[PDB]
Amino acid sequence: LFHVNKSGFPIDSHTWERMWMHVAKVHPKGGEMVGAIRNAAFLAKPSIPQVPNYRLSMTIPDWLQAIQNYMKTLQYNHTGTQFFEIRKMRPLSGLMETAKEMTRESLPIKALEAVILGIYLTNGQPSIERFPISFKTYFSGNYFHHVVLGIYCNGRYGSLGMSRRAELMDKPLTFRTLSDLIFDFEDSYKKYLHTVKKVKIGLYVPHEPHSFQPIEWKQLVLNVSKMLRADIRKELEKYARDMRMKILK
Amino acid sequence: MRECISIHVGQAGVQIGNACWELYCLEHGIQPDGQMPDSFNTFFSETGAGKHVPRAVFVDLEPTVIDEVRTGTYRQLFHPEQLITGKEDAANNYARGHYTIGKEIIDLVLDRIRKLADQCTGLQGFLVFHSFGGGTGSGFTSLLMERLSVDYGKKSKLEFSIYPAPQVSTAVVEPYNSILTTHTTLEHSDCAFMVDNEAIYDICRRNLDIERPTYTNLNRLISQIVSSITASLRFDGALNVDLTEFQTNLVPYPRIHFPLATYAPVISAEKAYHEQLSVAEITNACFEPANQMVKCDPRHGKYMACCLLYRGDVVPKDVNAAIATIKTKRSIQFVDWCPTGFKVGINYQPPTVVPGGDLAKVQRAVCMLSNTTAIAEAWARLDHKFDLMYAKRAFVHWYVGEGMEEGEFSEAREDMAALEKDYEEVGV
Amino acid sequence: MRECISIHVGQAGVQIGNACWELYCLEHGIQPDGQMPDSFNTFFSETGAGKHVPRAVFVDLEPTVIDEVRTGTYRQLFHPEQLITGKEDAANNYARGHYTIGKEIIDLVLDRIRKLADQCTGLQGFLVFHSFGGGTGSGFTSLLMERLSVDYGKKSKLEFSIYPAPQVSTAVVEPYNSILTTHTTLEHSDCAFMVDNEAIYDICRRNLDIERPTYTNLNRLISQIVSSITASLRFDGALNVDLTEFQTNLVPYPRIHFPLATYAPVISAEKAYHEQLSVAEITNACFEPANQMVKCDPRHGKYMACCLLYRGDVVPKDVNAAIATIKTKRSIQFVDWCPTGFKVGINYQPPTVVPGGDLAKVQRAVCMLSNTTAIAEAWARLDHKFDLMYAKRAFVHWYVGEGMEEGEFSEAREDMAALEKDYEEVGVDS
Amino acid sequence: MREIVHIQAGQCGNQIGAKFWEVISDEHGIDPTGSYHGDSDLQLERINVYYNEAAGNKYVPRAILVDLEPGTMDSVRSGPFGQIFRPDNFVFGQSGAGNNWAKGHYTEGAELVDSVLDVVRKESESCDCLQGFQLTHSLGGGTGSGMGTLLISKIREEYPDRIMNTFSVVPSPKVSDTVVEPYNATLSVHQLVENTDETYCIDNEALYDICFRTLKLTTPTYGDLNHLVSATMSGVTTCLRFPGQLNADLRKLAVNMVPFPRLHFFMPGFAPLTSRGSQQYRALTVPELTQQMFDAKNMMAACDPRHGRYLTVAAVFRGRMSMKEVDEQMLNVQNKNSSYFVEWIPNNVKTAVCDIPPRGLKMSATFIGNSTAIQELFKRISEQFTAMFRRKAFLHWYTGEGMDEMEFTEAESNMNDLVSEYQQYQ
């Protein structure tokens, strides 16, 4: 499994050599390009993507699109080594500090820190409202998990996130219902012959950055595979109504 | 060990709770100030120096009725914090109670329910009192019932609602509120007990011969029924029926849990002299259509399951003879798949009489609960009322503007269509 | 043969000490004039003819509060030399209290400490009372604690501070004082018990039903907690816990010793009749978030170690039962590396109620101390305050004018960041 | 002859010892003032086992009391039967050890240890035939654990040819009143194994279970638990003071219970324990006692004997009974429960009958079972140790007294060694 940087910055010797051993092992050709990049005297300096700023004139779907293209520009991590250690139960303010230092450094990003970045970017807009979604799925005799960030601006459901695949990480605000969104995710997942087993939905995140409220991820959980989609849709629409009225607590 | 905590919501709930707690205080001997001059353990808690505090939580979004209780004759009984108030009522609006004004107060009451439940060694269940017509007693009870179901998933909740009457009404948007409350009272309850004001008015006009009754008489009768239900936990008798034994023998299918109560003998203090009041007579009186506390016709429906909770000077042989006589009647039509449908319980404690009430000092009484199918009609009329208003979308702008959406009306109506279909399905 | 000496610095410290010594004189039966009409030995010295002298040192750079005590009803209690006074206040300035105006008085107090600690045989520690916001309670406490730490290396010092509240405040330069005092409170003291005014205002408004409480009520509550802490030294019970015992029980690592206190049952005389107030009830009342005397929610943290000092009519079986029901609850989250996290202590003397105050004459009471990780919020907010002002260099010229150096402002901030990081990195799983 | 020296360390040990002395003095018929007002000459025949004669014909206990805080001396001397002790045998310190093993063994206890050896030496050289010593203490603490360990090490180094009997109250997981119990417990029992001949692991949870279940007490204070422990204590060594048909001193129990040198940690019991209400619904006969002793709900250590065979068992009966009854009963007890006994020991029961019963009873019996289930009582502690020492929590308080980190690893390694050795015979 992919390992996590924990020495702050810069990267310590142990994690450095561990990552290089990992990439040497997995890469079939292996040592040639690895050693070439190690002993490369000069390499092209990557540019710094500029953090976009909210503007009132331009519309909110284009805002979500803009954050999505910036995230795409940030070169999604497939090196197999996390660079910013995240804790689920940690209070929100620590995650805001993590998000702002991550934007300062602008390194490769995975799904969890991608949705944290999305929360950090969208925290400035009371009209926009966002929450997490998680899937636990089954394929090839092993279980895998994925996480994305849903949005409910202007009475419409949309999705942001990251993945090595293309269509599993970005949807627009064009969904009347949350059920249509999650079933679209299920169909895209089936397109790769991966079976979703369980689906989990949390809560709207508070709009105050400097707070200690933790992020909820398990407030709703279903076993999607066993049950027929009608009951799933009914329970999900009940839950969406319970959420947008702020009743759940 | 055998304890229940009662919750009173809205004006109707609080005003019935007044009569209920007066009745319990008279039953167990407690003075209005709490000082007695071990059956009390079900409802009361001793707090040293011989002071008994009720296990009650009075709630309302308006400090006008709870203020009357606070300054009334029972000011020294309830714990001062148990009485919980707001600032502005729900205003006959479901959405004001369930969404806007209710969310600022629910935590303060759930904390006290938790604090009360911690004091119980063994908790039996809840007793929620409310009314369907109101906005507090619909939205707030929906919110509270959802939260209690999430928190205490095992305990059984028994509602005692005041269903709107066919003719007499004191509000223009009762159908909307009732249809919205039905979802919570069907999903989260265990035994909803429906009541009408017209039926009890007629009962006092015929039997008690009170030509100009008011809400005090109605609340006293309802309180007498509630005291009859929970008699087996407090006192002792030949055949005892607690809440879970009570729920079984009455609920054949998980959704069919809407019985309707009855009581007998209700008579004036002067008419008792000429009347024998034997067991057979009160048993027959319980089954007549003129003593039902819902304006409904039991003759057009079959009794699925029945339960006769006796109390006072009774012995099982007369009860058996009475039930045998009842079962051979042709008007009393039972359902085929229930060859026996009579649960019996007996207590040695006869009924009590409040000093200011117009009821006779009887020697034996019976509370008759029935899961009959006639109550569908009592719902059907109300659905008709809904159909007249929702066609024009009348009064809907208040509900949508308060926060609620519009599809909730349609889905509540379809759920009532489903419920009536289910009630018609059985008894075929 | 078991003692501790009390130092009260600044207006807040002196005013809390007033209530504290009122309470102590009440508990042991000492008259206001110090004449009784051997459990008093912890706080009082007998000097022939029954005269009782508190082991206190009242200090303030400004003479008005000390003069108020000199003219008050306890003029005959303290002997006059203990009440030391300056000439002009520190004026909410750390640099005046520490460097400029503190130098002229510090020797005159240190020797007095050297006198008092030379009268006792066995000494357990010090009870320092101060406030973070002030210029006296910060700078003068810094100087005094530095001098004592270099003097008595191995004597525990217990600060009882008053941390600034999040929203309620009564000064414009509080963050600059608190951040500067964070260096002395760490690394010199042994157990600092933070307290807020907003939390106690809420407690008095809700529990005691007082719409207009003033500082006297807050001082009475804090006095009750301190008298509960220093109770196993004066009386006897089933379990006894002196200073070093609960210091070893609480402080896991050397650099995190900031517990937050609690008390129960706080109830008015009217609501007492409708309440039972058993051991289980009061034990559960300590853990609800509406009773913490620091404006922070303990539900967003974990408890490292806890200490439940019971007193009154209690027996250990009830305490074990209550601790069991607490351990069953999933809301109250403890840390995995502390499988046992309760230090129990029972005492036989019940609480004492001052006549002029408003608290029920209850029969048992518990003081709960918790080394929880939720305290960092109470720090984090204040750092933000500092960050908003120091960015503009606002008010810095006042501090640098009194000889203070500017780099210390950034050094204190990075020290506080290090403290928060260390406090957060523990409590992680495994 | 065969005289016994008794020592007490810590609050728990001091209180249990005070109750033990009250029980013993009542048994022998001794005035609270120390004078003798007995009735039977059997009481006075073997008074010298625990008492010293003193001029004016009064009896002083052969006891020594130690603590690092002087409050417990005041409480013990003020309490009942506090004046019998000799004042010069009291040894106090300046302040307690908080709860710190390294404080009560290396820094603050090493200065007071010389006085306790000196008084013990005086008491032991003022007698002719010394059998052994008896200490009371608790493992979960700083004083009773560290000071007790230091004391037994020194005394054993000075008397290689005697026996010891430490009645240590082990720490249990459910009832817990201290945050650093596992460290102290492991550090002490590292040294109890090699420097002791018998150890009777009492526990508070099992005692509370006995009070609630059998005795049916509403409010069990520490007085009741100390009374039960004192009853066991008086039961164990009764054969040294009274005649019996088949008697057994401490060394006979030592050579019967212990097959291998390291296995000397016992679990006691006692019968008949009966509630006040249920006095009249029992026969008070040998079958009742024998059934009550082997009841799993009667052991004073919070362990389930069903998860371990008994290596060896003892039962010191007390009263006027027949001997064929005892033999047949403790034979069929073994045959009925053969699955709960060891196959490679032909006989697992050593009996002993003494004529004189307790004061308020017609007959009684004391169970002393060497069960292999006792590993559980240690296993839990080891787990707690590994929970804390993994993160070095609370550890700097012990390193501050000059105690290195490798001691903790050594003690834990030995702890696992002992648990493995006990588990080996299942």
Ligand SMILES: Nc1nc2c(ncn2[C@@H]2O[C@H](COP(=O)(O)CP(=O)(O)OP(=O)(O)O)[C@@H](O)[C@H]2O)c(=O)[nH]1
């Ligand atoms: N049967 C009894 N058990 C007790 C008694 N006192 C304590 N115990 C238990 O002892 C356990 C800890 O023992 P101690 O407090 O005596 C440790 P000690 O005093 O010897 O060292 P210091 O704390 O340094 O004084 C405590 O958790 C109690 O559960 C008692 O009087 N009787």
Ligand SMILES: Nc1nc2c(ncn2[C@@H]2O[C@H](COP(=O)(O)OP(=O)(O)OP(=O)(O)O)[C@@H](O)[C@H]2O)c(=O)[nH]1
């Ligand atoms: N039987 C009986 N019915 C009552 C009593 N008080 C009110 N009601 C009924 O309650 C119905 C309306 O509900 P309310 O209780 O007034 O409304 P609410 O629950 O207080 O909610 P709000 O309107 O927001 O105050 C009316 O149709 C009344 O018939 C009473 O004391 N006895």
Ligand SMILES: Nc1nc2c(ncn2[C@@H]2O[C@H](COP(=O)(O)OP(=O)(O)OP(=O)(O)O)[C@@H](O)[C@H]2O)c(=O)[nH]1
């Ligand atoms: N609880 C409590 N807090 C007080 C009291 N008096 C002042 N404070 C707090 O003290 C803070 C201000 O610092 P002070 O203690 O007054 O400063 P000082 O000690 O007088 O030092 P100088 O400013 O030089 O006079 C305020 O934020 C108050 O919250 C009091 O009587 N009780």
Ligand SMILES: [Mg+2]
């Ligand atoms: Mg109203």
Ligand SMILES: [Mg+2]
């Ligand atoms: Mg001042």
Ligand SMILES: [Mg+2]
């Ligand atoms: Mg001690």
